[PDB]
Amino acid sequence: MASNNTASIAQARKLVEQLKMEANIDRIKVSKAAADLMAYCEAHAKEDPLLTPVPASENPFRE
Amino acid sequence: SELDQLRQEAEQLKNQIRDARKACADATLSQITNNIDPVGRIQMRTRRTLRGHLAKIYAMHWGTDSRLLVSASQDGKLIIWDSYTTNKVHAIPLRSSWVMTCAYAPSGNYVACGGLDNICSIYNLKTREGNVRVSRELAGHTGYLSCCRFLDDNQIVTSSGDTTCALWDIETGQQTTTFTGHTGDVMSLSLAPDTRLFVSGACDASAKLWDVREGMCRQTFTGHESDINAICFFPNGNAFATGSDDATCRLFDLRADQELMTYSHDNIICGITSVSFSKSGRLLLAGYDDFNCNVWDALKADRAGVLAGHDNRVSCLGVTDDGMAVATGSWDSFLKIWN
Amino acid sequence: WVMTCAYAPSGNYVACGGLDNICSIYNLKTREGNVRVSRELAGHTGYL
Amino acid sequence: GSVSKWVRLNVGGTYFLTTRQTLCRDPKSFLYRLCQADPDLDSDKDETGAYLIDRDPTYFGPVLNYLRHGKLVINKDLAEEGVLEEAEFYNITSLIKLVKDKIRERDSKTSQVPVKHVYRVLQCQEEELTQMVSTMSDGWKFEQLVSIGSSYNYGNEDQAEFLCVVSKELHNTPYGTASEPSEKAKILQERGSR
Amino acid sequence: GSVSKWVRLNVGGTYFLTTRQTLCRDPKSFLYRLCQADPDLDSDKDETGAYLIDRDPTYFGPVLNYLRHGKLVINKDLAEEGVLEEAEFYNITSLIKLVKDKIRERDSKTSQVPVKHVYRVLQCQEEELTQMVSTMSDGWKFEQLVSIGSSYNYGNEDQAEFLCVVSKELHNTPYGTASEPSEKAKILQERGSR
Amino acid sequence: GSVSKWVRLNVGGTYFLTTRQTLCRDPKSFLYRLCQADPDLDSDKDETGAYLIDRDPTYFGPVLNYLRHGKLVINKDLAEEGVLEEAEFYNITSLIKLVKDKIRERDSKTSQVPVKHVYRVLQCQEEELTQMVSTMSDGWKFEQLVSIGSSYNYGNEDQAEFLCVVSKELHNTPYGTASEPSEKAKILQERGSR
């Protein structure tokens, strides 16, 4: 193959496609997802003992 | 030839894609906000020193029970530790050294291994006797395995070299869904909790997120210029951390299709080597090639602390599935359970 | 009775010579997982 | 066919008596074509009649066993290579697959003139020692146990009490060589050197 | 079958002239029905007046030997599997069971060729030591003895002073199995792991 | 005789029925001359025409195997040397070359009469121990590991704490008994001795 230099047209086709369906997916604004993450983390911050230490025999990792 | 329209057609698309993200771009409310609760200093001690390796551990990966972690040495041994009683549940020597993936199945019944052997071994921990017996040796990888992850106990995605991360049906030993498009070899293989999409880093600094059964490149995030080492999803699976050989980490969002916000300091110059998200996801815990790992407040971009104590680089990091303890795949032949 | 230790100018091979009159060329770096002899060189009745 | 259900065929001079259904089990074969008449077959014996086939009766045994009972049997004197070539002659693909798989198994196990032998050093203490020796990974052999003193508290009561050096025979690399290492692999080898 | 007590069969083209009594040893035998007349049986050769059994005579030999004199010995070059497969075609259950035992005995002795060795660890104080070393279970092998220093009953004469590894080769003599679907076994395996 | 496409060939009392064209596969075998019609062949079976070739039926087997389809297989109970000599008699040079290659490869793979070994001591400690054990040179065999009896650096993590040994087979090509000495080499041997 010398008309497409080892069929580099397949990778161009796939690049064009993946760009197309990257354009297809919706754009959700940065602050929206940021606030979503704050809400989730601060909701689950009473169940992460890394943030809130738990007694030595009330967890199996100070055992 | 036709490349003339192809090279054009990509450009404009790439252009608008960038513009789309610039269209989607807002001020990052997280870093803008400082009224969110601080996480304070975290100089937490390690409670277990799982010594018992004679070679540098490359990768360690927790099990679903958050008690058994598989640790792969550089010399070729898998130690399925017991974090509570520091007892070796099993030691699996391998046919080939230089293993860097330790895939614990989401059952405690299978383990997958691989490295420069170019062959992904699948070991059935449970057998008739009760001792380790190799279930399969998945061949068909041209390049070296980088990371392996079970979806089923008969289906496994196996990120490898040769710009592939194809998925194998375990029993037939056949690649089922092939993924191509990377220019650099794949290193990372991060599975979202949904297990229907997986994002993979590579040596081309482009985190390509693929739909697992379709074989199509859902997204191609890029914020790095250096090879991506490890990717750890949020317990939401909506955004993932991304570390490379640089002095910064990044947080990429699927919905925004662009970097949410980056985790950088001139306080350290060494590359990221491992990333992890806790139960909440509030803490981004990053292993480092500097002889200690760091923990950042993921929603404030400032280093919450450093887990000092190691004298050799933390070659890998893994947080428990309960999200309240973390283990280091340090190069000092010791895994330290930080809690 | 080896007296010669030859290091490659890249550090990826090694070589040695002794009274055996045969030179040893060892392929150090290989993803096999261990050092394997690459070549042996005979052709002298005298020691290297 | 061209004759009663039973037939006799003269494989190498040996008359095998069998029903055509054992032969017609796989419609793609020399034997299948032999059963039905056509202007390309004049083969029969002049003594009591038998279709003439100048093949090896020694290597026709397991081949016809693969058809009479749908599975092959390997004798301790008839080489797998002979049955392989004979099966290729009668175009029985699955039988060729099975024979070549057995040949690959035997050769991969025994063509290891150096045997290679890969050696591993497990680090274990007295307690887990019995477990992991008993629960040893099938496909290896224990070959040395070396007691080490304990770095803490005398010679025992530590995780460092025994080095179990095990080993297993193998064929090192299907390649027996590097086989195109990527830049990243060599970088990691240099890193892991020290 | 009502004539010629020395009934002549044409098994695989081989004229086996065998008595009715031997075949009637086990009526569970396809051939026992041939010892008697029955109207469905229309399998015959009219060139020798002998009935047809389109099965090879190479493995019919040991089967006929067992059936004639209540015991068989297979040659060291003839496949036990072939004798077995020829065996069920006449449906002699006891013969098939015995050949299954022989086959699994042989395969246990050839599972040794794969790198498959069962290892065990025993503990011993100095006095009792040789007693197990001498009167140890037949068919195993001694592999290693390590003296581990003791402070409980200091040094010598402590039970935990000596560790003796032993081993044999993996076998499937009565049969081998890879899994038992029974749940409670899995529960106990999980419990006993930690 | 030469009736039809086949020919009767009385090799060692066994009447092969073989294709005339398989004989014509090459002129190297003198059977070609027998296949053709030209005065000779006095001694023959005067009832059919089966030529009485007094040669081993068994070692003619692989020869006819090669001659019929151009591929060589040798039976696993018949010596390669008998096939070799039968090839010399039947004069197929390529077959002779192949059998000689097979014999030489088989003997070189197992070229060891008293079995010589060269043994090397590898001084090391526990830390890098697994490194040399895994990176142990391909072809060698680990044989025994000892810990140095030493009181320095606590005897644990002491740099000199272990003496591995490794062996590699010889008498395949021995160097101790193959001697071509050099005068300066002997001078240096004396220098190293003193």
* CB pair distance less than 8 Å for B1 and A4: yes
Rounded to 5°, the CA angle B66-B67-B69 comes to: 85
Phi, psi of E7 (to 5 degrees): -70, 135
Nearest to D154 among E79, E117, E151 (CB): E151
Q: Does the distance separating the beta carbons of F135 and B97 come in below 8 Å?
A: yes
Residue type, E150: S
> Which chain B residues are closer than 8 Å to F129 by Cβ?
54
Question: What's the distance, Cα to Cα, between the start and end of chain C in Å?
Answer: 10
Q: Which domains does chain A have, with CATH numbers?
A: 4-63 (4.10.260.10)
Q: State CA A21 to chain mean position distance.
A: 17
Residue of D nearest to F108 (CA): D113
Residues of D in contact with F154 (CB under 8 A): 151
Interface test with chain D among E121, E141, E143, E172, by most D beta carbons within 10 Å: E121
Alpha-carbon distance of E112 to B3, in angstroms, equals 61
3-state secondary structure at position B128: coil
Range of the domain at B18: 1-339
Cβ–Cβ < 8 Å for A36, B232: no
Query: Is residue D113 a contact partner of residue B110, using CB atoms and an 8 Å limit?
Result: no
Which of B335, B54, C28, B310 is closest to F125 using CA atoms?
B54
Q: Under DSSP, is residue F66 helix (H, G, I), strand (E, B) or coil?
A: helix
**Could you count the other beta carbons within 10 Å of the beta carbon of residue E144?**
18
In one-letter notation, the amino acid at residue B226 is S
> Please, do chains D and A touch (3+ CB pairs < 8 Å)?
no
Tracing tokens 């017991």 back to the chain, one arrives at B82
Q: How far is D40 from chain F (nearest CA, A)?
A: 13
DSSP state of E52: E
Q: How many CB atoms lie within 10 A of CB B249?
A: 25
Q: Which residues contact A36 (CB under 8 A, 6 or more apart)?
A: B238
If residue E121 lies in a helix (H) or strand (E), which one and from where to where? strand E117-124
- D188 → chain C, closest CA residue: C31
Q: Do E179 and B128 touch (CB under 8 A)?
A: yes
SS3 assignment, position B77: strand
Distance CA E82, CA E64 (A): 14
How many domains in chain B? 1
Q: Radius of gyration over alpha carbons of chain D, in Å?
A: 29
CATH number where B201 lies: 2.130.10.10
What is the three-class DSSP state of A10?
A: helix
- Which chain C residue has the Cα nearest residue B75? C33
Q: How many CA atoms lie within 13 A of A37 on its CB side?
A: 35
**How far is residue A14 from each of residues A17, B55, B218, D180, measured CA to CA in Å?**
5, 42, 11, 27
Contact list in B for residue D160 (CB cut-off 8 A) is: 51-52
Residues of B in contact with C33 (CB under 8 A): 76, 96-98, 116-117
Burial B51-62 (b: 16+ CB within 10 A, else e): bbbbbbbbbbbb
DSSP structural state of residue A54 = -
For A60, list phi and psi in degrees, rounded to 5: -90, 10
Cβ-contact B226, B247 below 8 angstroms = no
Q: How far is CA B207 from the centre of its chain?
A: 12
Q: CB A30 to CB B218 under 8 A?
A: no
For residue E89, give the chain D residue with the closest CA.
Answer: D69
E116 touches chain D (CB under 8 A): yes
Resolution value (Å, 1 decimal): 3.9
Alpha carbon separation from E155 to D45, E161, F61 (Å, rounded): 87, 7, 69
Is residue B124 classed as helix, strand or coil in its secondary structure? strand
Q: Are F22 and F35 in contact (CB under 8 A)?
A: no
